[PDB]
Design a protein around this ligand. Structure first.
Ligand code: HEM
Ligand code: HEM
Ligand code: Q15
Ligand code: Q15
Ligand code: H4B
Ligand code: H4B
Ligand code: ZN
Lengths: 418, 420
């Protein structure tokens, strides 16, 4: 019932009471742990699944109850009157609207409960842009551009989420088909390999399939593909002036820059579903700033990504004959030193994995005292390099699902009717 | 029910039907995941929890069932008579003895089932030494020495395990107090600094208290502390000629040797409990060979261990002033390069993390093919550096508990009833 977590490097023990509020399910049972499945059913929301009048009210009450608790006015007339108001409106309309205040609290808290996110110490500083009055793709494009500009802030990045109208009958969905607002194109060849980013090959083709003339570079910023109100989606190019990029160079190896690598500054996840008080915001792109490893370990070095390790090791003149020389490892460290140094040099916000994990531990400790715990997913929180020399490695974490939340949702192209 | 696991680097999908044979429990529920908890309730065995006839026979039946399928004799006359024999023996004596074959099979399986072990490709080559005739500590010391010598094999290491008598009434336990058979002393100093291995401080105090005269150096092999038949434990120095050690140097850095580091060649875990057919074998040391990171990342570089990163980064004159310089990540790699280099030079078996994880992926796929699954703990299988440039990071894994199995048990010094 009450539950301990131990840091094995510091012997600190924290008691968890927050988990007993867990409203959603994990994927696990007494018989099988699923802690390392990317996408259990539970973590996804399929669009067929429209909320019914009966399921919606419980969800609303629970949400409004925590809302009114947070502003220390639990069980007050304003609490009670709101609960009735929303009640009535469900009874009549079969949905309800959130007050701005609730929208903002809802968004901040979905981030707060993102148990896979290492960056949550920052959860309370989110800028929320209410785009609920949007009606078209053009509108969405305008909203996104404003989001991007505000977030980038000349390199001094600021967290933001833009919130498009909530799902209704699931026929009128707003969606951003892009998985991130800013990503590079991926192209195959007759040759057979890949040019640019292999992660985006399909999506890159879906855009070309829609009229995108592609400049066919290794770093073509993909067009936004936007869908308002269940309509066919539309292509739009983000003004390059709004897309901050960093050329990647090494603080010690001047040959580094000769590979002509760069990366974009703004990580802005776009494909997720934001759920507040049973309401579904299926388009809610959000952004903050990069932990260095997301670019350097994963984006460059994952086999099925830019896979530059082989290339970097060669220029480093390391013994690539045998795994046991740790050449892959050696190179991985330099590549990451480079990314951090470039961003830092161009005064664009970035955090190293040592620092982020330190902050997250402070954050857990804060959440244990003030809230009674902090849901956390060790498989995702531990960074993908130097795992055990970061303090999160030695930290037991409890993972459970609280609401409001971000959830995954199927790729729109498998679901949309034309 | 069928269950699917995806590998996100290769899109290989596998199907687990084996989880359906899973008896024990995880710690998780529909509403919590305890997958990152180190010692959950269910992964441990308190010695006060000694089994009744009541619960024993199903566990015995289950196990003998598994045993006779593996040798293709399910429902054999030999199978039924063994069932009735064991049954008669349980009602009569309240326990029962494993045949040699069953001990051998049980032990391989515990290993095969060890979901936190990346070494498992090797599970079928385990030398099992049956020490079920041992009645004393001195008997224990003698057995362990033969294990160490045989497993060491002049640097060409061989998996082995030594199995001492099972629990009876939980008052007569055999136990190896050591957590590993070979380990370096740790000494807290009055100024608060530690000399030798910080992991081992407590155990070192117990030893010193039990009579050990401590050389008090940075790398002193601790004596064995051994309990037989529930008796107070006794002390023994492994003969040094039996302890293979490898001085640590770096292929390119000549100053590295001057850090004065060395490590022992044989990883040999001695504190776990072996559960076979409901039977409990509370001293059962087993040994293998090292994955480099186990010394190079954890043993030297954990803040809570020899913590040599500072000194190695110093000597590389790295920019240690900001973390964002990755001086820790850089020092970590060099140290690990050094560890693999020293072991290979001296022809002491060792495996690097890339090579071990690749093997484990092949093992795992084969285990799905022919066994119907492979229980795996991702949190433990992924290496402690360079996670995502090894293929296990991208591998979805089902974790669940099968018997036979290796369990944790509480530290003997916490539970033992002193004879004085
Ligand atoms: C401010 C800097 C931030 C940093 C450094 C950061 C860091 C991370 C990292 C490393 C991950 C792991 C995912 C991966 O490897 O691709 C992650 C996941 C995530 N973060 Fe953040 N984060 C930040 C801000 C945000 C913001 C603003 C939100 C939303 C408001 C957010 C919500 C999430 C969610 C939902 C996930 C995981 C989705 C899932 O699988 O369930 N984070 N974060
Ligand atoms: C062949 C050489 C072997 C290698 C390279 C190897 C590798 C490993 C590693 C790296 C771990 C994780 C431990 C840690 O990081 O602290 C581990 C766990 C384990 N291995 Fe091995 N292993 C080997 C042989 C064996 C043998 C012979 C056995 C028993 C017969 C065994 C049983 C285990 C068990 C039971 C655990 C996990 C303990 C737990 O439940 O928490 N392994 N192995
Ligand atoms: C706002 C934000 C900031 C940041 N630094 N990093 C992120 C990335 O976090 C997410 C959040 C949700 C999904 C996701 O993508 C999953 C893919 C799967 C393969 N590896 C990582 C990317 C990544 C977001
Ligand atoms: C036979 C063998 C070979 C090998 N290479 N590595 C191992 C390591 O296996 C274990 C098996 C059980 C416990 C354990 O360590 C547990 C604690 C927790 C943190 N690490 C060290 C002590 C390590 C065994
Ligand atoms: C199979 C495994 O669950 C998958 O590769 C996960 C593991 N941990 C991760 N952790 C982070 N931060 N990001 C990821 O994409 C993944 N991938
Ligand atoms: C809290 C966490 O479970 C703990 O630090 C675990 C994580 N993964 C590990 N993995 C291995 N191989 N060895 C370990 O000791 C640990 N420690
Ligand atoms: Zn779990």
């Amino acid at each position: 019932r009450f539950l301990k977590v131990k840091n094995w490097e510091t012997d600190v023990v924290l008691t968890d009471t927050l988990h007993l509020k867990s409203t959603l399910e994990t994927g696990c049972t007494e018989h099988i742990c699923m802690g390392s499945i990317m996408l259990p059913s539970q973590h996804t929301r399929k669009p067929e699944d429209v909320r019914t009048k009966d399921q919606l009210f419980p969800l609303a009450k629970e949400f409004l109850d925590q809302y009114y608790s947070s502003i220390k006015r639990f069980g007050s007339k304003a609490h009670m009157d709101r609960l009735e108001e929303v009640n009535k409106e469900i009874e009549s309309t079969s949905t309800y609207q959130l007050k701005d205040t609730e929208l903002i609290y809802g968004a901040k808290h979905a981030w707060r409960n993102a148990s896979r996110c290492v960056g949550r110490i920052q959860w309370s500083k989110l800028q929320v842009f209410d785009a609920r009055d949007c009606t078209t793709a053009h509108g969405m494009f305008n909203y996104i551009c404003n989001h991007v500009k505000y977030a980038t802030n000349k390199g001094n990045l600021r967290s933001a989420i833009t919130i498009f109208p909530q799902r209704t009958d699931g026929k009128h969905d707003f969606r951003v088909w892009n998985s991130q607002l800013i990503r590079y194109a991926g192209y195959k060849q007759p040759d057979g390999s890949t040019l640019g980013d292999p992660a985006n090959v399909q999506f890159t083709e879906i855009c070309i399939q829609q009229g995108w003339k592609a400049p066919r570079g290794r770093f073509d910023v993909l067009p936004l593909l936007l869908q308002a109100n269940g309509n066919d989606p539309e292509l739009f190019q983000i003004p390059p002036e709004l897309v901050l990029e960093v050329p990647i160079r090494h603080p010690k190896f001047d040959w580094f820059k000769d590979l002509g690598l760069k990366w974009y500054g703004l990580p802005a996840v776009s494909n997720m579903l934001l759920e507040i008080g049973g309401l579904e915001f299926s388009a809610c792109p959000f952004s903050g700033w990069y932990m260095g490893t997301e670019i350097g370990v994963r984006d460059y070095c994952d086999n099925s990504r830019y896979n530059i390790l082989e290339e970097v090791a060669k220029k480093m003149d390391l013994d690539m004959r045998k795994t046991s020389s740790l050449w892959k490892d050696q190179a991985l460290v330099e590549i990451n030193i480079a990314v951090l140094y470039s961003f830092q040099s161009d005064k664009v916000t970035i955090v190293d994995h040592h620092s982020a994990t330190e902050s997250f531990i402070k954050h857990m400790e804060n959440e244990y005292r003030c809230r009674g715990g902090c849901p956390a997913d060790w498989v995702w929180i531990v960074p993908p390099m130097s795992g055990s020399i970061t303090p999160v490695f030695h930290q037991e974490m409890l993972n459970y699902r609280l609401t409001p939340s971000f959830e995954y949702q199927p790729d729109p192209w498998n679901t949309h009717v034309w």
